[PDB]
């Protein structure tokens, strides 16, 4: 059993540069990863940093795909003009990666929707993967732009135009912001001046905690097909809040008494979500709890009972059994230079609720304001688009808002 990982863009392969560092440091159990990867980007600067880095010999030279020139924060450019010449080479490699494989669980894609490469050719890669395989799962861990913290200007245009394909192509989509992670590193990790490297290190922790069930034998294992049923009650509602516990420094960890009861609680407070949204406004549709390390089924069982009996958070009226647990034996590993201390046990929670319906509504106004005056539209239209797909992507998010409001009732 193996699962291969695709990384797109400046954000994608930097996340991968930390994720693969953790995989090699963690390791027959290796068979699911050893790498079965592909980096691809339009700007050669970040890929060729890997080609000369410490992991020169680790990656086969062909694997590291690199175009000639960047899409430059332009969804249309990275989806219609420049994507068309590189995407064919990428997926015609990924095929022979799958032919190397025999028991493919799925693919997992890493991209940020704000940019052009992460968004544009992300969706383009996804569309040819869906028509080629269809049944095989493709987990997409995307990075959406934050409400108030922002680096680009045209990112609302990109985020809406990317989402229109992220609905019906990916199977399980995990949101991740930058402000929420910045807040996590500021609050729990007490790092007052964080950079992208620290963000990517703890993103890898989440990925590792949800594939450790395939790699190592636990008391209750869970495959990628399991998330497919247990968390998405409707074919078009797959957008997951993420959380992790205990995110804790090296000194505080020894002082505190980490156990199963309190980390099940800590994984539920909005002070520890990976996406800037308040689930107090929403109702939980389903929850999924990956437990790693020193876990007996009793205290995880007792912990979900206390959550259900609390009234600070509510569930939908549909699910009395609104949980999916999972226990694995091997504890989480640490990276030298990393900030997370060694813990006997950790919890990665992936939920689904209606709080996500707020982020789309928040997104709508920013896109709406700019589009009404036709700001920046001339860049995308001359690239090959029209006014049709702007308006039609707009009404797709309008439908999604009504959808969440209907299901939440």
């Amino acid at each position: 059993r193996e699962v291969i990982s695709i990384h797109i863009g400046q954000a994608g392969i930097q996340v991968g540069n930390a994720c693969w560092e953790l995989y090699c440091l963690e390791h027959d159990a290796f068979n699911t990863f050893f790498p079965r990867c592909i980096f691809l980007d339009l700007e050669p600067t970040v890929v060729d940093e890997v080609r000369t880095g410490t992991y020169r010999q680790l990656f086969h030279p062909e694997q590291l795909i690199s175009g000639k020139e960047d899409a430059a924060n332009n969804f249309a450019r990275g989806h219609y003009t420049i994507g068309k010449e590189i995407v064919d080479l990428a997926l015609d490699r990924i095929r022979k990666l799958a032919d190397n494989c025999t028991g493919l669980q799925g693919f997992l894609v890493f991209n940020a929707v704000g940019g052009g490469t992460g968004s544009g050719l992300g969706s383009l890669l996804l569309e040819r993967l869906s028509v080629d395989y269809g049944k095989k799962s493709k987990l997409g861990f995307t990075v959406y732009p934050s409400p108030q913290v922002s680096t680009a200007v045209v990112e609302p245009y990109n985020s809406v135009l990317s989402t229109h394909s992220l609905l019906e192509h990916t199977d399980v989509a995990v949101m991740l912001d930058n402000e929420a992670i910045y807040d996590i590193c500021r609050r729990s990790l007490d790092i007052e001046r964080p950079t992208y490297t620290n963000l990517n290190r703890l993103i890898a922790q989440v990925i590792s905690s949800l594939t450790a069930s395939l790699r190592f034998d636990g008391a209750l294992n869970v495959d990628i097909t399991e998330f497919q049923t247990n968390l998405v009650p409707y074919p078009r509602i797959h957008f997951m809040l993420s959380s992790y516990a205990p995110i804790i420094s090296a000194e505080k960890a020894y002082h505190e008494q980490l156990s199963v009861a309190e980390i099940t609680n800590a994984a539920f407070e909005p002070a520890s979500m990976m996406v800037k949204c308040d689930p107090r406004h929403g109702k939980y549709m389903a929850c999924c709890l990956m437990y790693r390390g020193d876990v007996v089924p009793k205290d995880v069982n007792a912990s979900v009972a206390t959550i259900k009996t609390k009234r600070t958070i509510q569930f939908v009226d549909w699910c009395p059994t609104g949980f999916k647990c999972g226990i694995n034996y091997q504890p989480p590993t640490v990276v030298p230079g990393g900030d997370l201390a060694k813990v006997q046990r950790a919890v990665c929670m992936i939920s689904n609720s209606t709080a996500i319906g707020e982020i789309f509504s928040r997104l709508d106004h920013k896109f709406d304001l700019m589009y009404a005056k036709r700001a920046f539209v001339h860049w995308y239209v001359g690239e090959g688009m029209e006014e049709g797909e702007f308006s039609e992507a707009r009404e797709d998010l309008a439908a999604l808002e009504k959808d969440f409001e209907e299901v939440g009732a």
Binding site: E43, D48, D70, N73, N74, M370, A375
Partner: protein, 426 residues
């Protein structure tokens, strides 16, 4: 990989470009004799963006000097970093225009523009993936403005997809060297609005004012002013030459700062800029760089941005810094000074971080604000232009060369409709 061909025109262009190639050659560690002598590995792998390996480690710049008077060429060849250019690239007329835009655009350009195009073509296809061209000229002179402007139009006809940067200085009435400044600048802008991709506006008032107030220089010759302009140009194309935590090429900045195709006149600033006596009395943090960036008395144009609103803004950072501090600082200035920014655009600030500082510094920054205060100069120019043209002063020096009255009226028309669209979007 990505390629930048350099083109310099006129006296202003040649001397600005001379200081430019001095600082770039030092950044890549190339000696005045043309051979590599740097220390870090990082300085080798991205010199093809600016140089060509000839033979025996001879790295010659990919530049084209262009003028009509030999004084500038000989002064270029005389000084250091003067023996690094290919003598075939010194394309050079002989008669001279002399602050007559008509000479540099219809009569004398007609016999030089053929030779420059031959050199720039052979120099363009010599490299594989062109990123764009980079022009440094003026709008007051004749052989800089007129010939350089005509060269911009011909280049955009041949290569319509490739990028185009123009560092152009504009005349102001407080520093007025020639008498026919309005006649030249108005006609030059008429061609810049339709031919260039983006124009980073400069001026001598702000440059002299900057060296007085902030730098506190005693005798600011053209060397120091050209040194400042070169530091801006190195900062704008540091992303191609060095790896960073967030990259932003030329096209990336262009699409994030230009919301409408005719709105491509920028203001520029460089930080940090401190007096030599106070260089050790200061920290080097991101907030300090931001306070000096958003100061209205720090733009390198004589147009106060607080007289209007910013449409967009850009900040290219260099150095080991935390991206969170970058975004928090940009958000902070976006909330406290809410009236100076446009409302129907949230996020008026694009940011980027490169990992290699300029030589000698720890952390630097470059600001490019596309504001609506730039329209004051166009009005500040058009009022002078009408003052002459109501009464046909100096007009015959251009009329007997080919321009008719409709050309000047067309230049007034384009200037007037432009200032109305900046006023519209404010």
């Amino acid at each position: 990989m990505r390629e930048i061909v350099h083109i310099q025109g006129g006296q202003c262009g040649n001397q600005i470009g001379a200081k430019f190639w001095e600082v770039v050659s030092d950044e890549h560690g190339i000696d005045p004799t043309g051979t590599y002598h740097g220390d870090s590995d990082l300085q080798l792998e991205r010199i093809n963006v600016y140089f060509n390996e000839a033979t025996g480690g001879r790295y010659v710049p990919r530049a084209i000097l262009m003028d009509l008077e030999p004084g500038t060429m000989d002064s270029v060849r005389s000084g250091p970093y003067g023996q690094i250019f290919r003598p075939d690239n010194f394309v050079f007329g002989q008669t001279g225009a002399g602050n007559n835009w008509a000479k540099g655009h219809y009569t004398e350009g007609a016999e030089l523009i053929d030779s420059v195009l031959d050199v720039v073509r052979k120099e363009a296809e010599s490299c594989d993936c062109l990123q764009g061209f980079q022009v440094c000229h003026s709008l007051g002179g004749g052989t800089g403005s007129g010939m350089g402007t005509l060269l911009i139009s011909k280049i955009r006809e041949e290569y319509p997809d490739r990028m185009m940067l123009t560092f152009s200085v504009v005349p102001s009435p407080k520093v007025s060297d020639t008498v026919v400044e309005p006649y030249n600048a108005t006609l030059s802008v008429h061609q810049l609005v339709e031919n260039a991709d983006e124009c980073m506006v400069l001026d001598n008032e702000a440059l002299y004012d900057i060296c007085f107030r902030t730098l506190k220089l005693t005798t600011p010759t053209f060397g120091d002013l050209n040194h400042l302009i070169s530091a801006v140009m190195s900062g704008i194309t540091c992303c191609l030459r060095f790896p960073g935590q967030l990259n932003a090429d030329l096209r990336k900045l262009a699409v994030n700062l230009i919301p409408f195709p005719r709105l491509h006149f920028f203001m520029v600033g460089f930080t940090p800029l401190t007096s030599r006596g106070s260089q050790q009395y200061r920290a080097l943090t991101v907030p300090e760089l931001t306070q000096q960036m958003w100061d209205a008395k720090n733009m390198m144009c004589a147009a106060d941005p607080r007289h209007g609103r910013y449409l967009t803004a850009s900040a290219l950072f260099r150095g080991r810094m935390s991206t969170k501090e970058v975004d928090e600082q940009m958000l902070n200035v976006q909330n406290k000074n809410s009236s100076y920014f446009v409302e129907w655009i949230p996020n008026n600030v694009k940011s980027s971080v490169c990992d290699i500082p300029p030589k000698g510094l720890k952390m630097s920054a470059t600001f490019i604000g596309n504001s609506t205060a730039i329209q004051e100069m166009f009005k500040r120019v058009s009022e002078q232009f009408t003052a002459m043209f109501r009464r046909k002063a100096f007009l015959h020096w251009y009329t007997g060369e080919g321009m008719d009255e409709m050309e000047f009226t067309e230049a007034e028309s384009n200037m007037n409709d432009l200032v109305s669209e900046y006023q519209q979007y404010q």
